[PDB]
Amino acid sequence: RPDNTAFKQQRLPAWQPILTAGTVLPIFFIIGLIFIPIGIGIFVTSNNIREIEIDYTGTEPSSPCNKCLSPDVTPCFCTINFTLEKSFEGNVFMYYGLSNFYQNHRRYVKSRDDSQLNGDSSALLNPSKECEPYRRNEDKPIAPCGAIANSMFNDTLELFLIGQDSYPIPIALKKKGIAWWTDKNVKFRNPPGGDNLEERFKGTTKPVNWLKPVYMLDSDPDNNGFINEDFIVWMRTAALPTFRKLYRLIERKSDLHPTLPAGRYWLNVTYNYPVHYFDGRKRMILSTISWMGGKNPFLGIAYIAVGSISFLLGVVLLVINHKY
Amino acid sequence: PVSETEAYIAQRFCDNRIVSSKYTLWNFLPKNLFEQFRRIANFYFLIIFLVQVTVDTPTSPVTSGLPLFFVITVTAIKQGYEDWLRHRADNEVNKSTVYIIENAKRVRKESEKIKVGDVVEVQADETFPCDLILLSSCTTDGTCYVTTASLDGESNCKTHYAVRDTIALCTAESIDTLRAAIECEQPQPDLYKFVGRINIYSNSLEAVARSLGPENLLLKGATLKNTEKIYGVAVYTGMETKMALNYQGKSQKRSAVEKSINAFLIVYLFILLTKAAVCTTLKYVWQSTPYNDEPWYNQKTQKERETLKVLKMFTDFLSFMVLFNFIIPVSMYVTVEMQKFLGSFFISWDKDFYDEEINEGALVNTSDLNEELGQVDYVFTDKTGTLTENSMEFIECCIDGHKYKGVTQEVDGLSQTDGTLTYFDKVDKNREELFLRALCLCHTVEIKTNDAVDGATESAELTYISSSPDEIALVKGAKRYGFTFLGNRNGYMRVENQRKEIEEYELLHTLNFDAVRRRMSVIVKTQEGDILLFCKGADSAVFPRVQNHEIELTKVHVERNAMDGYRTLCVAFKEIAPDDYERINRQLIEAKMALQDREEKMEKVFDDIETNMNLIGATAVEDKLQDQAAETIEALHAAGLKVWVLTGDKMETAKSTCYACRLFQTNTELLELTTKTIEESERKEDRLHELLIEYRKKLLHEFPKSTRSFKKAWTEHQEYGLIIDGSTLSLILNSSQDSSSNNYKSIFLQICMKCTAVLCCRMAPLQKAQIVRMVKNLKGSPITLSIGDGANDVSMILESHVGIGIKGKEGRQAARNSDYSVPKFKHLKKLLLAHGHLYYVRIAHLVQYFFYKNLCFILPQFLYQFFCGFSQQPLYDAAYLTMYNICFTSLPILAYSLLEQHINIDTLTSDPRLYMKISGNAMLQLGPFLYWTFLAAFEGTVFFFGTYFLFQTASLEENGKVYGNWTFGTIVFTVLVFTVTLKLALDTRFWTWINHFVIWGSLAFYVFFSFFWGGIIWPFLKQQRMYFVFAQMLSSVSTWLAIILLIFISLFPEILLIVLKNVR
Ligand SMILES: CCCCCCCCCCCCCCCCCC(=O)OC[C@H](COP(=O)(O)OC[C@H](N)C(=O)O)OC(=O)CCCCCCCCCCCCCCCCC
Ligand SMILES: OC[C@H]1OC[C@@H](O)[C@@H](O)[C@@H]1O
Ligand SMILES: [Mg+2]
User: Fold this and answer.
1) What burial class does residue B1021 get, using C-beta atoms within 10 Å of its C-beta: 0-12 exposed, 13-18 middle, 19+ buried?
2) Residue B39 — left, alpha, or beta (φ > 0 → left; ψ -120 to 50 → alpha)?
3) Where are the disulfide bridges (chain A)?
4) Does the annotation flag B792 for ligand binding?
5) Which domain holds residue A299?
6) Judgement on whether residues A170 and A153 belong to the same structural domain of the protein
7) How many CA atoms within 13 Å lie on the side-chain side of B119?
8) I need a labelling partner for B319 at 20 to 30 A (CA). Which of B277, B550, B620, B932 fits?
9) Other CB atoms within 10 A of residue B104 CB
10) H, E, C per residue of B742-760
11) Do A187 and B1018 touch (CB under 8 A)?
12) A214 shares a domain with A117
């Protein structure tokens, strides 16, 4: 009587909603009527999108790049002719895809030292312990302290078009924003200060395998030191045995003509990344995109199924309890 | 053997204290810790912590110790509170105000310090603080009156006397009284006998029994009445009851579900073991030969630590288990204790059952058996103290079935207000005269001579003191009518018919109440005439006389009276001749004054003297209950519970109130195992099967069968069970190792089981614990609940799976010893029928859920190793793994446990048939276990596979970018939390306004925290793996449409279930 309250006598306001067959029956019907169309939609949408890939690894003397596979003269070259049966007007995207490259690995991701990357003062001085193998080389601090940076994807590619004139016709590309705005402008920046680029690193050597330093990669300084977009995208662990990385990109011109037309194209590469040592492939994939993305009919058929399934379920659920 | 020093008082003896606590002030940790490690989770994480001290391991010792100590201490506090509560409740009664004056201090002392050999003053209406020796009573004849309704549970009063008188007034003023001393022996626990000498050639003997026994020795809780102050010595005997209760000294922490917790952890530990074995082995074999150093991305210092052939194997085995050890959950104990404790107050601060008297409605003793309360199967109850009190009253006598009773009512309000001048005698002043006269006579009452102010109570004190209250209430009924029965000590029961008329009579001879005959009579001489013969007798002991004029009228009413649970007492008389009376007189004194085997001669003669009589009706008397019998017993019978009564009150009144509670149906062919005790010592051996093997199967196959789920309708139930006495029980229990033809205890339980109910009369507390353990072993293991009033059945409170006590019914001391206290037998229905069963649904859903979350959380973490180079690279963020998981998981589920009734308390209280039978223990049997794990698989596999399927493009963003490793893992983490939370939300039924807020609030906590972390706190801290990654993920509308499908497919089977579980 004196200390009684609702919380102490289980008599609080109970919303108490209770379900049954007749209450969820529509839910199944409605979700089917909504899912089936949405799924078939994303299916055709992500379907129409046209993509194409080519493996320039060799592994077949039949392919011209095979004779350029094993250790050959340092600057190896090879061409891989390919045809484009269809022309895609949508502003294209260029990715370099690889296989059997275990990006996701404790030792491979733990070597990334966000300090030197972000551009910290005390960082440049000493690299952390997590980057146990590539801390220094011959007792000199490395700026890109990490096995990921050491294992950069440097083999560059060049794509040309062929028209009625059998000789080549290169295609223009833009290096801006190959990485997201955040992981390039705020996530990482240059050391404490500097108007020029070399002064920022005084006694700082470079990664072992990397021959030329990072301060000598791109002409414009907004894409050279620890902010080079190519290297930054590679510094993103995809987490899959096989994965794709965006190299460059060919956006459409402010005009209405079609970006890439139908015809034979020329592909020449610079083979400077060995992979046959572990039976891994190397390739490049070009494609268009949409609000969904490149070819991936998974979500489409998934919605088709989930919808139709729930719908048929309601069908039975209804035609059975209706017998009352 | 006690010296009992003469000039001195005492030394070298065990004083009296209160021992009802579990742990001790000094060695509590060595007790609580071992009792706490019976929970495997703690054991597994402690062995893991211990192992993490051999060589350098990636996991730090602090993150290995913190999971243990944060859990160990919580239970330690919620175990301490309990023991300290019992300690305070014990100290209060330990330091009780006690009157005592022997050595020097004239003032009164405390019961905490009372050495042996000390005179103790026990005022009127005082509870004996200990057991004493009495040979000095203040009042004349050194006679007092004491009742033992808590020690042995006797309804009949205790008679005793002493030799000296008020020697205490001289003990304080002088030392002359301290001349004598007492010698004792090795104290025996039962307390039946204690012998010695007291400084003179005199054998001071004593012995207890289940009936009225000891006079000299006193006992604890022996309520004192009809006296001023008494003085006794030798306090050490108080330890006798302590030694009688100590049987339950240390058997505390258990549960019906916590056993299943460890059994659950078994297969769960095997799950871990299996995953660790597969991961480690399938790594060594699959990539160990050529991929160890080939990838060239990394090169371990000193070639994989000089490639130790097997040390690497073990270092990685641990690296896998410690990462997989979330399967085995330890944070489920802190939350389970929070439920166990914060759910305790639900019964404490409750008005649903609060005695209007300052007496407390309930008390909470332990926070360890709440969940198993509403999960009982067998119940052991008591008669006096719980079902009734040590008294009895009479109502509606039947003189030829003519006397009835009425009350005030709407239509019949005129005749009840004022008595008419004609209705005062229709069937009363015709025979009621002799009826009430015989009532006032033939009774060994011997009432008090002095009295207090006549008018303090309804009429006067009117205290008639006899040996048993069987007839003490009959005189009170005579008082209700016109008769009074005043004095009678030196006169023949002077009484008053209706008005203030003395009605004196002379008592010539009085007959005894023997057990072979079972009748009580008296021979008196009236003042206005000749001699008469009054008598009452038993049922079939007095009906022997022909009584042609009036048989059916009284016989059927006696039948219905005994059936309803009354103690039918017939009444008759006869006219004796003046000369034949002398013939009987002489032949009776010839046997009385004969000193050669009078027990046989006297019995034969005074048994044949009564050869006929005149039946004058009957009188029914009932031993009133404490609560309505049908709701308490009918509800348990319908709920399934097996009800048994093991008590310490006389068999006659035992059978009486048991038959009154309707547990003994009208047509119950009862069985007894007490009348064949003195005769045929080895017949019981070949009698058990002849009465149970032969009869049960006979009536079971004569008529159709009787199922286990539903019963109590067919003629099979006709054959009720039995009632045993403490003798036959201890005779068929310890000495059943002689004959090997057929087992005896086995068949004893075989009959005690398949029946309506059973009664165990003449049973000691230890003797009742044997029955508790008797049922605690057959057919696996059922659950036992016991409840009693005083220290007689308190030795069952802990032996039974759960202890329920009533305070003040007889002895309160028994409640603080119990696990729960409820001074209301009526409200025990609410306790186990609602508050406990709710705890079961609550924590059962809680455990299935906790395992569900920690498995749906880690299964993707395991399958991910298939794509990770089995380098145990967590897909989940480092802190995100533990931090948000425990910051979310614990809140809504604890809300479910604390405040949630899958079905409300009143709708379940109104119907137990559809409440307890459906529950059982199936909440966490292999039925729902394998079903829930399927849900663990389906969601853990769909999370992973679905996300990995959508990742086949590298173009999710509306513009098209790469997707970091932690993005994928934080995608599955997301669908995971949304799925588990919404899952619980769909599984809940009680949507209180404070639970609805925490569920949605925790999901909010998720979005809010993950977003805050994603955007500001990156450069100020030590290091961060993902910066604006959570948002970068949420930027692709693709993932929206994908994750929603993932959670939907995850909960689709649950939705289906809900539909099924609620329809049909
Ligand atoms: C005040 C702020 C404090 C902030 C934290 C300060 C941190 C200081 C820590 C200093 C410790 C330095 C330890 C040395 C560097 C660690 C190296 C390491 O992690 O080894 C990893 C190795 C890797 O094996 P594998 O390649 O997958 O095996 C392949 C196999 N042969 C096969 O293919 O089949 O697998 C192994 O054999 C393990 C070797 C030992 C790993 C020790 C790692 C400890 C790192 C610290 C982790 C901290 C975690 C959080 C702790 C919280 C503490 C409160
Ligand atoms: O052939 C392996 C090469 O790798 C390291 C480079 O610095 C050279 O010193 C060495 O010869
Ligand atoms: Mg009792």
Assistant:
1) exposed
2) beta
3) 65-78, 68-76, 131-145
4) yes
5) 17-49+295-324
6) yes
7) 25
8) B932
9) 7
10) CCCHHHHHHHHHCCCCEEE
11) yes
12) yes
Chain B: residue nearest A134 by CA? B298
Cα–Cα distances in angstroms (integers) from residue B579 to residues B177, B528, B584, B589, B614, in the given order: 58, 18, 9, 16, 21
> Which residue's C-alpha comes closest to atom 12 of ligand 1?
A129
**Contact (Cβ atoms closer than 8 angstroms) between residue B775 and residue B784:** yes
Residues of chain B contacting A317 with CB distance shorter than 8 Å: 1059
- Answer yes or no: is the C-beta of B743 below 6 A from any ligand 1 atom: no
Question: Counting Cβ atoms within 10 Å, is residue B146 exposed (0-12), middle (13-18) or buried (19+)?
Answer: buried
- A164, B946 contact by CB (below 8 A): no
Amino acid at B351: K
User: Tell me, what amino acid is at A101?
Assistant: F
Residue found under tokens 């007291």: B198
Distance CA A240, CA A100 (A): 9
Choose one of B56, B288, B297 to mutate for the ligand 1 pocket test, by most ligand atoms within 8 angstroms of C-beta: B56
**In the structure encoding, which two tokens stand for residue A274, read together?**
């060995």
CB contact under 8 A, B296 and A239: no
Which residues does residue B531 pair with via DSSP β-bridges, in sequence order?
B525
**Cα(B159)–Cα(B996) distance, integer angstroms:** 66
Tell me the β-bridge partners of A282: A98
For residue B474, which phi and psi values (nearest 5 degrees)?
-65, -40
Closest Cα in chain A to B1044: A303
- Mutant choice from A28, A49, A105 vs B, greatest count of B C-beta within 10 A: A105
Annotated ligand binding at B139? The verdict is: no
Q: B671-673 and B223-225 as β-strands: parallel, antiparallel, unpaired?
A: unpaired
Active-site annotation holds for B877: no
Residues A141 and A222 in one domain: yes
Residue B950 is given by DSSP the state: H
What single string gives the DSSP state of each residue in B81-134?
HHHHHHHHHHHHHHT-EEB--SSS--S-EETTS--SS--EEEETT---SS--EE
> Is residue A184 domain-shared with residue A308, that is, in the same domain?
no
State this model's resolution in angstroms.
Answer: 3.9
Domain locations in chain B? Answer: 341-348+833-1062, 393-404+428-452+460-622
Amino acid identity, residue A287? S
* Total number of domains constituting chain A: 2
Asked whether A231 and A214 are in contact (CB, 8 A), the reply is yes
A45 with A64, same domain? Answer: no
Distance from the Cα of A7 to chain B's closest Cα (Å) equals 9
Of the candidates A180, A175, A177, A183, the residue with the CA atom closest to the CA atom of residue A248:
A175
B561 neighbors B618 (Cβ within 8 angstroms): yes
Contact B852, B396 (CB under 8 A): no
d(CA B818, CA B805): 6
A138 assigned to some structural domain: yes
Q: Annotate B9-25 with b (16+ C-beta within 10 A) or e (fewer).
A: bbeebebbebebbbbee
Is residue A65 domain-shared with residue A29, that is, in the same domain? no
Cβ B406 vs Cβ B412: under 8 Å: yes
Instruction: For residues B591 and B597, give the distance between their C-alpha atoms in angstroms, rounded to a whole number.
Output: 9
Burial label for B231, CB within 10 Å (0-12, 13-18, 19+), is: buried
What's the one-letter identity of residue B484?
T
> Chain A residues with CB inside 8 Å of B904's CB?
14
Q: Is the CB of B60 under 6 A from ligand 1?
A: yes
Residue A274 and residue A156 share a domain: yes
CATH class of B393-404+428-452+460-622: alpha beta
* A178 lies in some domain: yes
Q: Is B15 annotated as a binding residue?
A: no
Q: Which residues pair with A243 in a beta bridge?
A: A98
Determine the Cα–Cα distance for residues B366 and B69; give it in Å rounded to an integer.
22
Closest by alpha carbon to A96, among A259, A310, A271? A271
| Judgement on whether residues A81 and A167 belong to the same structural domain of the protein | yes
